[PDB]
Swiss-Prot record, chains A, B, C, D, E:
Membrane topology: Multi-pass membrane protein
CC terms in the record's Gene Ontology section: gap junction; plasma membrane
Gene name per UniProt: inx-6
Residues passing through the membrane, by range: 30-48, 103-123, 182-202, 268-288
Molecular-function GO term, any one: gap junction hemi-channel activity
PROSITE patterns attached to this UniProt entry: PANNEXIN
Nucleus in keyword set: no
PANTHER family linked to this entry: INNEXIN, INNEXIN-6
Full protein name: Innexin-6
Single GO biological process annotation from the record: monoatomic ion transmembrane transport
Entry similarity comment: Belongs to the pannexin family.
Amino acid sequence: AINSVNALISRVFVQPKGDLADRLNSRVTVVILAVSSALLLSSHFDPITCWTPAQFNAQWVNFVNQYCFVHGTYFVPLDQQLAFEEEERTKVSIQYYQWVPYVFALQAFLFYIPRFIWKAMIAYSGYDLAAAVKYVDRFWSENRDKDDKFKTRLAAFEGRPSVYIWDGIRLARKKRSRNMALFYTLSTVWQAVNAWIQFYILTQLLDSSIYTLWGPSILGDLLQGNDWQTTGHFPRIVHCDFNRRRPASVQLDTVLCVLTLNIYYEKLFIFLWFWLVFVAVVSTVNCFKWIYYLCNKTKAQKTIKNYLSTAPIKSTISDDQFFSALGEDGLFIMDQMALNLGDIPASYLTISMRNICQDF
Amino acid sequence: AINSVNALISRVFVQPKGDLADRLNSRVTVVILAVSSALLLSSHFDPITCWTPAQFNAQWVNFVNQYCFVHGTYFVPLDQQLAFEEEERTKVSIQYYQWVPYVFALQAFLFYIPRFIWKAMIAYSGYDLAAAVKYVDRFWSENRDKDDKFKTRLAAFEGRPSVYIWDGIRLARKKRSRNMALFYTLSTVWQAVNAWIQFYILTQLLDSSIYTLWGPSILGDLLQGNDWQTTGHFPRIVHCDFNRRRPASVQLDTVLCVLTLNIYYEKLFIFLWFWLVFVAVVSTVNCFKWIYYLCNKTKAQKTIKNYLSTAPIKSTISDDQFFSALGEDGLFIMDQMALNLGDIPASYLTISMRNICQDF
Amino acid sequence: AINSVNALISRVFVQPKGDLADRLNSRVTVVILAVSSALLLSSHFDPITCWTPAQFNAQWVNFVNQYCFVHGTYFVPLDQQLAFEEEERTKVSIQYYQWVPYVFALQAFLFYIPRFIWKAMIAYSGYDLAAAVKYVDRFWSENRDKDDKFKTRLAAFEGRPSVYIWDGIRLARKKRSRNMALFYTLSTVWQAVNAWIQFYILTQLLDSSIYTLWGPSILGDLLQGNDWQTTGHFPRIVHCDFNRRRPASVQLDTVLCVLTLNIYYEKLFIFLWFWLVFVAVVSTVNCFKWIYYLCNKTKAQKTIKNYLSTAPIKSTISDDQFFSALGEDGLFIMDQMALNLGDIPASYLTISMRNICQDF
Amino acid sequence: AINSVNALISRVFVQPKGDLADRLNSRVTVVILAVSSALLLSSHFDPITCWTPAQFNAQWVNFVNQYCFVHGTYFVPLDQQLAFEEEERTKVSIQYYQWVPYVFALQAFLFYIPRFIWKAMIAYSGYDLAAAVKYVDRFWSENRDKDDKFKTRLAAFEGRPSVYIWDGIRLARKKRSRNMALFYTLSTVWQAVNAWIQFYILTQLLDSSIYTLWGPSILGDLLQGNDWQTTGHFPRIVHCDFNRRRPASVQLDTVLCVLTLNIYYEKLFIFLWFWLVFVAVVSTVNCFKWIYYLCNKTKAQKTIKNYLSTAPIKSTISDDQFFSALGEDGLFIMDQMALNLGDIPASYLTISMRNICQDF
Amino acid sequence: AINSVNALISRVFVQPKGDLADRLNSRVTVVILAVSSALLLSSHFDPITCWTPAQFNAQWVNFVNQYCFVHGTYFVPLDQQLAFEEEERTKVSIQYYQWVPYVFALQAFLFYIPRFIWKAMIAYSGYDLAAAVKYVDRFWSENRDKDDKFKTRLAAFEGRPSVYIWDGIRLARKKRSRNMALFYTLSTVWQAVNAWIQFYILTQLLDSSIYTLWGPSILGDLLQGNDWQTTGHFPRIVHCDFNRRRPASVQLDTVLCVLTLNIYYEKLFIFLWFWLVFVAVVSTVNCFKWIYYLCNKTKAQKTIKNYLSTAPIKSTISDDQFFSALGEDGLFIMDQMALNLGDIPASYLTISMRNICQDF
């Protein structure tokens, strides 16, 4: 069949509000893994077809098909006979159907967790960003328009938003955060780990009994023209095993099945592998970034200090103290706002706050 | 087939108005259990397929299929013959089809009850929150916008909303609540119990005649590579039993059926198990939280007292009395509002109410 | 079947905002390759049909069809017998099904990368264009309307937008760009390479074991009336190979299959080939363009200097210094704005900025 | 089946903005050729049916059908036997299936190119019309309404739009166009050629080995009652050729197929032929028109000069100089505007521009 | 099946703007012929069914059905045997399937041409009506509303629209029309011819070899109870002819087919015939109308002169001269406006124009 659902994509793909760089890779991740997870268990709506000899009446075929699909399957390169017992026949054993389609659902779930962690934790801090972001935001969106406030613009920031935030610090700083930075950087480590664990669940997918994969090995095989059966691995054609019961007991036999899926799974696994391990490496640099921010922190002030390097007319107040009274949570939320609302406005914001900060 | 219904999700998933933390897990719960409950009895629209010998004309196959699906089924690892009588054959007996799809409907229903309890009970108290929440809410939403009220903002709260609530206390406090807190904390205990009972209904699902499950045992089996039949448990292939009637009486026989569902049910039961018992443990801490709030209550005042720790200019009125006249219902609804409307505004609210409170 | 999806087209096809010339060929590219990539693996929803002799019961036909489709196929012109062994039979070997449908997905992905590169990199520069573009943009859209500002128009630019940008340079020029031009021209080289690599992946598609293609050779064959089999190449009718297993081991045979797809693939490959290699040559001239801009750069100033060649009344300020203090990032963003917003307005912009530039 | 898509039609059929006479025939062309191109490869969703003798089991019929459809077909009038070898049998050879459905896609593409050429080239000139057209346009649309400007109308044009254009000439005329006319007339020649080439691709469709067609010959045959087979040409019933392989090698035979399509293709080819060659002849007169405009050019001024033949009160300024300073690009864009916006307004425009033109 | 498309009807059926009497019969025509043209080639989605003797395996039936449908068919009243050769058998020969469904498409096309002619030609005149119609139109629509202009209404017309038109005459009358009337009346003759030609293409449909039809003959037969076969004409049951090829050459035979369509075609042909020849006779009177307008023309002035027969207060200006300076194009466009906008307003228009006409 053919079907396409846009609104389900647009919903999470956009509606949760943040631009946060390369953390949106958690989003786009969850999308890819979610979709492919589904479309695979879609059964291409012919999961697997099999060969059965000719006297079965076709209501056995529609059986032996399933029975093959559930009870295990395996492979042999072809012409070895089968030998006997279980040993040489079942050595090379491929069933991942018990794994792929669901383990991806689990995947996407574990890429969407860390956000939920974040919102929960930042809610623990008692000081919400999201409210602030929207508030100062549509502030800027609207008043930006009007001609009136440009030369007045600075004082406008001085009155309306700047005090709002600063109060936010008043109420908040009493309750359980100077520490929000550390909460955050926890969320970024936790993120990076989660990614890695995912990667390792790929390589340990298939099974640690029968080898494992990583991309340019496999490609560098395919590109060597090693096909599949003559790799000995990634089979497209298998020999299924099957049973009956009569007064003679086990009564078993083999029927060789064509295998369609295996063309998919080892079409994508390459791609999905590149793309994950990418998501790891890009998601770790952002992880240590906030430690290298958190330990040093004397050169953290840079950008903020740098905003006071434009500083029209430079009225009075010194900084080092001013940074001191502000040291923790503000220093962060500033970076956040500058990130969402962009560069130019947040300058206006800070240069306001320094000015009106007096009693604190 | 393929079908997806968004509006049914968005409806309860959002439209009932509250942000209440981790109580929305009752919501998302009801979603998951509801959906899976349905999609399972969807019959993947091939419930179970069976093997029958070859002279049945295919209008018996479409019978013996059902008949197998209703009358019991069972399992044996394979090669034991069957022995005889009923004993060794029917020992290992798996039918949960009579349970899963409906018992989940019951599940979701019992996660949605406790809300209905709450709204009913809080309606018994005679003092509604929801009205207040919306009222003070869109108050803040609108007037927040306008530039006019900032330096005036405080007095604005003083007039419009603050009196409104306070009157709410006037009418209410005459009728059947100082006690609303205790009502609430009942609802949270009741909640936690309900969750637990649900868990136990999982472990007691399947049946207390044949073992029971809990997750990392099962996984820690699968990850041991114990497959299913060689676990002896969670079978994917069964031996169905069947009857006719002729002048010779019982006239019975066996036909081995493939079983598709059992790949689902023991794909999800793991996940659903983690996720429930999670929902329990996160829903209990919130349960005792309101006892540790309700017994102590002298350090309950903390946050509220803490709001009067900003307190511009601190005009006159003392607190301890002021908390005394307010002791019960207000002390709560304050926390509620601060929870929904966020931190900064509710401060404005309280610091108003203290001020205008005179005659009471 | 018949189905057509517009919104998926319009979405990326338009919604990402830029008019950038002939870089939108990356867009339209991604469209074509995306669509054809899909519609081919649509299986014209009869992938391939085969001939099998007459005693197969039709549940083998529905097998041998697939089995042919996965295990390799090949061609021979017809009447050579088959000879024997593997040599003369399998010499002329055509299976690209393992390639085309997916390798196109990869294609489109690699044409959409370079944008993502660009937005990421220009975000590294800390100075965003997009904000500016929209801002100055709807500036012009709205105020253009009103009659009031025409004779006043110039001063209007002087106040509202011009200062806005200039500040943008203030904040930005402190942080990590004078260099944005070089970033950009990297993105254009990278672009051109990517295109070329794509072309070469075409010619190396099929396989470097069996010849390769380029368009007017093939056409210039077809137009010679060389058909296909009597080209010896691009076969429409193949001889599939097939196996069983009995006590006699390999037990193999051949069945000649009709091949429908090959009429598609060698209907389009021509077209797609022209259109790619086009996209290369048009995308390289634009590549060196920004080097010939970046090295010289003394005649880069031309257009900008040329705007100050209209210059009402020519108040005072000299240029060469004025260009000097502006040298890098501005010089570019000017070209950008003139590109998006068109010619006439950006003149107004620059001629404003020169005027108000004083302290810097 | 039955399906109809309007929005795809309306989209290009309207949304690209211009009224340009008889150049919209490029548009309506692309429509017709596009649609018929598709609906033909729709396979009337029975491409061709064939006769095969009676022992084929119907999974060969569904083969020999295709195999006939790909490997060539041919015709003989009926009763000649077949003779032998390949000569007299395959002389009269009709397969155009390898051509029609795709070569039309190519067609429509080549009628849509010349626009893209135009927009690209006119963008090279640096002076955009489209902006101007919309601008002056909705100018006229809105202010036309208001009663205020009628007696004032002239001066209104004097201020708002007229200066806007004139500035457009200031910025533009510095950069790479006095020449836009020649660019344009190139686009019209190029257009006319493209059309002709299309025609010739019709007549050379079918093949230059077996005759060729032009309409009133064919009709003038049909209207003579020459049917088809007794034309010897345009067959509706063919004798397909077919192969097997057994130990005896080529093993070939013939099966006569009914042919449905050929009723379509030679139903439309007539119509499509008239309509193309029309589009040529109407598109050439417009081609030389702009040479007869470009060489003479002294009588080009006519219309424009004629507008200054109404000229309220005729203040001062002479013309011949005035045309001289305006000579090139303006002279054109005037004609354009008068074409889109109609006759009456553009008069107002010019008669404004003459007046305010002073310094230039 | 069942399907109904409204928007395709409403689109041309309304959206092209004019009320022009009985010229809209060109519109409704194009509708009827278009629809029936389509629904007939819809194949009632069983085109024709045939009788074949009993040993054909049903994949010949699905052949001989088509083959009958393409190669000719014929009729005989029944019991004549067949005689022999081709003479007495094939004398009475009915195949119009090669004609009806497409020749109707051609029909509708030729009823829609004359409009396109008109718009093209009236565009040649350089003076557009449509603009005027819309302009003066929504003039009247809006200002009609307002109470203010009633006693002032006349002067309102005097200022706003009336001058607008008159200017239209200024610009236009310089360029290539006093003659627009003659252009128009050409379009009406051309119209009438086209209609007639259509009629004659009906009567010459079927074929001029076998009789021809006109309505009340046929009806006056049916109403005589002449049925069909015992008319000898309009057969519902035919004897199809058919071939094979074996070593014995032509090998031909006959199979009698039921014929469903012929119940349709000779259900509608009656109706469609009445309705066409109607459209002719009503479309000719309107044709000569504009000659009897164009030659006389002294009594053409009637209506216009008659408007100046109400003429409040009759200020000064004479008419005969006034008509003289206006003689041609205006005299027409007046009739047009009065036709679209109705009677009462256009009076206001003319009585304005006479008044303000001075210098001309």
